Amino acid sequence: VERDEVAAQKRELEKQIERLSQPSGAEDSRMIALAERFGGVLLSEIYDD
Amino acid sequence: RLIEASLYGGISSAITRSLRDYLLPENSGVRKAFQDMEAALRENRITLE
Amino acid sequence: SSKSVANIIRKTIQREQNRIRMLNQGLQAVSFGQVRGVRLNVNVRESHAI
What gap in Å lies between CA C28 and CA B32, rounded to an integer? Predict the structure, then answer.
């Protein structure tokens, strides 16, 4: 039980880290393709700096 | 290097050699996506070894 | 994958070229003996362009 609970925390931590990764951390799964399929730019990327 | 090159004067040899290392900032965006995507394989390889 | 990576690389390259071009203008018409201007020339290697 302790092993599994710690595993759950570790999974949550990796998922949290992964959301902040790339390219400008966002809902990257579809958003990058959705950004180029229209003549647009992701807002979070405009506010990168 | 910057300070002492300014102090003595002249076209610094060391600055001239590594020009890109001095004038260009390093960008992480291009990389960390692929480090995270690569992670599952890295762990598996290390475990196998 | 593929195209999107190329686009981010291209935009990064373009932004660096533009910033350099802006820095470059501040150094126009500087007189040092017979030298009259200085530039940072930026180019893309072929083996990577292809």
Answer: 38
Query: Which among A14, A19, A22, A32 is the top mutation candidate for probing chain B, defined by the most B β-carbons within 10 Å of its own β-carbon?
Result: A22
Helix, strand or coil for residue A1? coil
Instruction: Count how many residues are written for chain A.
Output: 49
Positive or negative: CA dihedral B38, B44, B45, B47: positive
Rounded distance, CA A26 to CA B49, Å? Answer: 35
Q: Record the tokens describing residue B10, joined without a space.
A: 């002249």
Interchain CB contact of C16 with B (< 8 Å): yes
Whether A24 contacts chain B with CB within 8 A: yes
List Cβ neighbours of B12 (8 Å cut-off, separation of 6 or more): B1, B5
Which method was it determined by?
cryo-EM
Residues recorded for chain C: 50
Locate all alpha helices (DSSP H) within chain C, ordered by sequence.
3-25, 46-49
How many CB atoms are closer than 10 A to CB C8? 19
Q: How far apart are CA A13 and CA A18, in angstroms?
A: 8
Listed resolution, Å: 4.3
